[PDB]
Structure 1
Amino acid sequence: CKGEVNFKRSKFVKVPSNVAPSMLFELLLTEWHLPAPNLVVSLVGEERLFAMKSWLRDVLRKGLVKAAQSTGAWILTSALHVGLARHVGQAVRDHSLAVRVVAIGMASLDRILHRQLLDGTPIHYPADLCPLDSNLSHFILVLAELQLSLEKHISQQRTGSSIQIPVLCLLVNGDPSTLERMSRAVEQAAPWLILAGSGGIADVLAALVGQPHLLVPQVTEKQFREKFPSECFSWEAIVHWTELLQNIAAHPHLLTVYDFEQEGSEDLDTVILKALVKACKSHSRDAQDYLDELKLAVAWDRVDIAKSEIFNGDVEWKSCDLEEVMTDALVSNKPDFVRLFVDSGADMAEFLTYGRLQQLYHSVSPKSLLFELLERKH
């Protein structure tokens, strides 16, 4: 049941739970004609109680999205709620006003206001239970099972020349319930990035990933008493969450906690790429599996990390498979990478044939002068 709301027409699809994710992703791609994503990051925090500090806003939005505007990605931001969601949404629109970054809003149809009017073709939605935003341009209206299964589907489908799609999760000061949402997520093999100064459950998590005895019989009670003390908790409820934490902390490779206020020198893209490579290390050591992440590095122009982490000597590279990324580095004229690829084992002797050279010459930017010269001569 696809429809559009002409507010600025925004599309929406009503989907019940346990629906085949493949059908959803394919309907998205075809009927909305959205570009293939080179990255997807899923938000996990929305608490309107605590405002966003400076050190958070500046980097998290400006420094991250200004860089991501070069390669584009998807943002699985929760809609129909009040929080940083509308901030990020309008931020993307203001950045585009000046490869694209888009936000997809998914939310349960019950918590929305004026849902009968939408269920019964732009359904007028002027709103003074919580009302819905009119900034986000797309809606997947129903839910945690859907988000988990859709992440499992995206992290698996191969859109490549056969390359994967990287997935990442960004936890920003969430409520205790999200614990469950994260628990099974560790089984789903998707790297988590936890902001240590966020100020929700991210705080207690950042604290309790490293301990002498990671088992938290009552120190978890101590932390939950320390942070957000307005909410009292039953010991019988705790005795379960502590086991949840004891299970989650049993996979250190996936999750990574990071602090931004102490030394913000490392921008967001650096830690994102670092966590992605750290997670992809544990899975396998094949040549092809590293390609997607590697491509992302080329888009960020981060030679030092690609040299330290990828080309450390673990993955044995051959001259056969570096051709695609080599052409991608040539066309984008990043020369610090071409030298690295040549030294890593690639050869210009067998790679460059007259067909490849014609393909390179076809790729001249249409605005440039050589383009017009060759076109006029032809």
Structure 2
Amino acid sequence: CKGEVNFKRSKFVKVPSNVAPSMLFELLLTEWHLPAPNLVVSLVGEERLFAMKSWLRDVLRKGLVKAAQSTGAWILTSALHVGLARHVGQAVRDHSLAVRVVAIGMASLDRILHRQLLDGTPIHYPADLCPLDSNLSHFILVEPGNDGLAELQLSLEKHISQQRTSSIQIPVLCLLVNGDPSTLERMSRAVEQAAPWLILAGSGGIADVLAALVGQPHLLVPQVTEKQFREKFPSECFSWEAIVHWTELLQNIAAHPHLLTVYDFEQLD
């Protein structure tokens, strides 16, 4: 379901979950005629409420720009970013005007604004429930469950970590930046896929608490997880049952300490 939106012509494909990742990847490559990427990195946090630490954010952006201007890599942010990712995307687009990296946006059709209009070719969306920006020069859309989208992104990741296809293997990295609680469960799905994770000490509450949780391996710590969640963003109260359920995922993730590690940036390639 290929679509071209005229605004700068931006391409996208409507693809539901449980669709061939090999076919998706090869169709995308062939369609947009991208060059084979040396490295792929994936954004995982979309808490618009958590504003980027100005100096920390500038440092991260400068480091990413410096790394990407030379080696070449690919990005996996969300489609029609409006939160924290929104502005970093426009900054990267600004950099692009003045080896090449192409940002990619993936999202579900449900939350997207004009989603009925898009499902039915100049497409203009001049919005000052998600508007698009020129950051999505190429776009990725799905219209199937939230876990479905998680497994979809996971399948794309795993298929990028594929075999020779002179064996060539393009490394994939995940960046966890002040995510939702769901991101934690999402990381679980990545833990089984052997995905090297990266988290930030000072990005936000979720990553900061994760820095302590897995580091201290506790079989049973439901009250500790409760006190932590109350410490970090106590916006909505959680049931003790769901807290034990997330504690189970904490025990599962911590069991794989090699694949992920945390570094204190406020304290690069």
**Interval containing the TM-score (normalised by the shorter chain):** over 0.9
Cα 1:118/1:249, change in 2 over 3 Å? same
User: 1:158 corresponds to which residue?
Assistant: 164
Aligned twin of 1:252: 257
Give the SS at the match of 1:223.
helix
Does the 8 Å contact 1:175/1:200 carry over to 2? no
Question: 1:213/1:85 Cα in 2 relative to 1: closer, same or farther (>3 Å)?
Answer: closer
Q: Deviations over 1:325-368 (max 9, x none)?
A: xxxxxxxxxxxxxxxxxxxxxxxxxxxxxxxxxxxxxxxxxxxx
Flag structure 1 segments of 5+ consecutive residues without an equivalent. Answer: 263-378
Matches of 1:163 and 1:152 in 2, distance apart?
A: 14
Deviation string 1:79-136 (CA, Å, 9 cap, x unpaired) is: 2342232223222222222211111111001111111111112323233423233431
Q: CA deviation at 1:230?
A: 1.9
Query: How many Å apart are 1:149 and its aligned residue?
Result: 0.6
Q: CA shift at 1:152, angstroms?
A: 0.7
Moved more, 116-125 or 100-109: 116-125
Q: In 2, Cα distance between the equivalents of 1:26 and 1:212?
A: 41
Structure 1 or 2: more helix by fraction: 1
CA deviation profile, 1:304-327 (whole Å, cap 9, x unmatched): xxxxxxxxxxxxxxxxxxxxxxxx
Q: Any idea what SS the aligned residue of 2:78 has? A: coil
Distance 1:141 1:198, change over 3 A: same
* TM-score using structure 1 length: 0.66
Q: Secondary structure at the match of 2:134?
A: coil
User: How far apart are 1:199 and its partner, in Å?
Assistant: 1.0
Instruction: Give yes or no for contact 1:158–1:165 (8 Å, CA) kept in 2.
Output: no
Q: Is the Cα–Cα contact under 8 Å of residues 208 and 214 in structure 1 kept in the other structure?
A: no
Higher strand residue share: 2
1:150, CA displacement in angstroms? 0.4
Preserved CA contact (<8 Å) 2:46 2:179: yes
Identity of aligned residues (%): 100
CA-to-aligned-CA distance 1:199-239 (integer Å, 9 cap, x gap)? 13111101112226354231111101111112111111101
Identify the range of structure 1 (115-124 vs 104-113) with the bigger mean alpha-carbon deviation.
Answer: 115-124
* Mapped contact 1:172–1:200 kept (Cα < 8 A): no
Alignment pair present for 1:193 and 2:172: no
Rounded to whole Å, the distance in 2 between the matches of 1:203 and 1:214 is 20
CA–CA separation in structure 1 for the residues paired with 2:110 and 2:215: 39
Residue in 2 aligned with 1:43?
43
CA change 1:250–1:31 in 2 (3 A) is same
Moved more, 24-33 or 205-214: 205-214
| Pairwise CA distance, 1:157 | 4.1
Local SS of the residue matching 1:50: coil
Aligned-pair distance for 1:64? 2.0
The SS at the match of 1:218 is helix
Q: Is the 8 A contact 2:103 2:135 kept in 1?
A: no
Does the aligned pair in 2 maintain the 1:43–1:169 contact within 8 Å? yes
CA distance in 2, matches of 1:78, 1:200: 21
CA contact (8 A) 1:55 1:260 kept: no
How far, CA to CA, are the matches of 1:167 and 1:43 in structure 2?
Answer: 11
Residue-by-residue CA offset, 1:164-212 (whole Å, 9 max, x unaligned): 1101100001010111110021000110011011113111101112226
User: Conserved in 1, the CA contact under 8 Å of 2:104 and 2:136?
Assistant: yes
Tell me if structure 2 keeps the 8 A contact 1:3–1:122.
no
Contact 2:80–2:136 at 8 Å: present in 1 too?
Answer: no
Determine which structure has greater relative contact order: mean sequence separation of CA pairs < 8 Å that are 6+ residues apart, divided by chain length: 2
- Partner-residue secondary structure (3-state), 1:156: coil
Structure 2-normalised TM-score?
A: 0.92
Cα distance change on mapping 1:3 and 1:130 into 2, 3 Å: closer
Distance in 1 (alpha carbons) for counterparts of 2:33 and 2:25:
11
Any idea what SS the aligned residue of 1:94 has?
A: helix
How many residues align? The count is 261
Q: Provide the residue aligned with 1:119 in structure 2.
A: 119
Deviations, residues 135-163 of structure 1 (Å, cap 9, x unaligned): 3111111111110110010011435x222
Query: In terms of mean alpha carbon deviation, does 15-24 or 213-222 score higher?
Result: 213-222
Distance across 2 between alignment mates of 1:62 and 1:84: 16
Seen in structure 2, the aligned counterparts of structure 1 residues 26 and 66 have a Cα distance that, compared at 3 Å, is: same
1:3–1:19 Cα change, 3 Å: same
Give the conservation status (yes or no) of the 8 Å contact 1:157–1:165: no
Spell out, residue by residue over 1:7-61, the C-alpha distance to the aligned partner (whole angstroms, 9 max, x if none).
1111111111110111110011111000100000000001111211123212210
CA contact 1:80–1:133 (8 Å) conserved in 2? yes
C-alpha distance in structure 1 between counterparts of 2:94 and 2:129, whole Å: 29
Aligned counterparts of 1:126 and 1:260: Cα–Cα separation in 2: 37
Closer, same or farther: CA 105–222 of 1 in aligned 2, 3 Å: same
Q: Which moved more, 1:245-254 or 1:59-68?
A: 59-68
1:259-282: CA deviation from partner (whole Å, max 9, x where unpaired): 1112xxxxxxxxxxxxxxxxxxxx
